Homo-oligomer: A and B are copies of this chain.
């Protein structure tokens, strides 16, 4: 079937460009674990023609992995080969010839955005300003603009899936559900667009909805979307035009931007260029 064909392809040593010798990777501490995989910090010797050791993150599966988890890992690898942008997590390669499948990616020293924010606190505890957050959103929007031009739909945009690198640079991560636009879903209900929920449709404009949820997570420094509303009742609330209210410590201009990402009609949402543009304008205008 499709997976056996991808696994067999992958285990062929064909593209030397993305195949990294296992003996030059030294796995370090576990950065984090799910039910079916984990991320581990590592060092890689002579990665991509670089001197000495480069610190990397390594994604791998656990023993109880399903075909679904193996397909998402292989899918992520196949997608990140074609992308390069400063605010998208970089792929360095994979180990496909000795032991388990390992994906080698860019290390971002600070972890997930959601974590980084929940550690934080706002100011006019780690201290962040409105200019900081707007910077964050803008970085993500630039990365999303780039993806949308390559006609990639990310599907899983959320603060849990953005990483924070040195210099507080944002890296969009977790491409295992992405699809090249050019069945029941596995994206959490509370980040999905109404047409995704009712019609199982994903487009860049459903990424723009998810972006509005992610915007809300930023300004609330890691809040949980629609608190006290169970995922199962959200279908109905949204269909009748309820949305999250304007949060505390959030401007009228930011909130408007949010609400527009959540228009029922995908055509009436902004595109990522407009979202970037709004953010560029807010920042010059706050100096």
* A residues at B contact (CB < 8 Å): 1-4, 7-8, 11-12, 34-35, 61, 63-68, 70-71, 99-101, 183-190, 192, 197-200, 224, 230-233, 235-236
| B71, B100, B189: the one within 8 Å of A65 (CB) | B189
A187 engages B101 (CB within 8 Å): no
Please name 13 further chain A to chain B contacts, defined as beta carbons within 8 Å, in addition to the given A68-B185, A101-B230, sorted by A numbering. Answer: A7-B232, A11-B235, A34-B35, A35-B35, A64-B190, A65-B232, A67-B186, A68-B183, A68-B184, A70-B189, A99-B230, A100-B230, A101-B232
Contacts of A66 in B (CB 8 A): 184-189
B236 engages A11 (CB within 8 Å): yes
Q: How far is the CB of A60 from chain B (nearest CB, A)?
A: 9
Q: How far is the CB of A101 from chain B (nearest CB, A)?
A: 5
Once the chains are docked, how many angstroms separate the CA of A68 from the CA of B155?
A: 14
* Closest residue of B by beta carbon distance from A74: B232
Contacts of A188 in B (CB 8 A): 63-66
Contacts of A2 in B (CB 8 A): 184
| B4, B8, B65: the one within 8 Å of A231 (CB) | B65
| B12, B184, B224: the one within 8 Å of A3 (CB) | B184
Q: How far is the CB of A214 from chain B (nearest CB, A)?
A: 14
Contacts of A101 in B (CB 8 A): 230, 232
A231 engages B70 (CB within 8 Å): yes
Once the chains are docked, how many angstroms separate the CA of A12 from the CA of B70?
A: 32
Q: How far is the CB of A95 from chain B (nearest CB, A)?
A: 11
- With A7-B232, A184-B68 already in contact, the answer to whether A63 and B190 are too (CB < 8 A) is yes
Contacts of A1 in B (CB 8 A): 197-200
A63 engages B231 (CB within 8 Å): yes
Q: What are 11 A-B pairs with beta-carbon distances under 8 A?
A: A4-B235, A8-B235, A11-B236, A34-B35, A35-B35, A64-B190, A65-B189, A66-B185, A66-B187, A68-B185, A183-B183
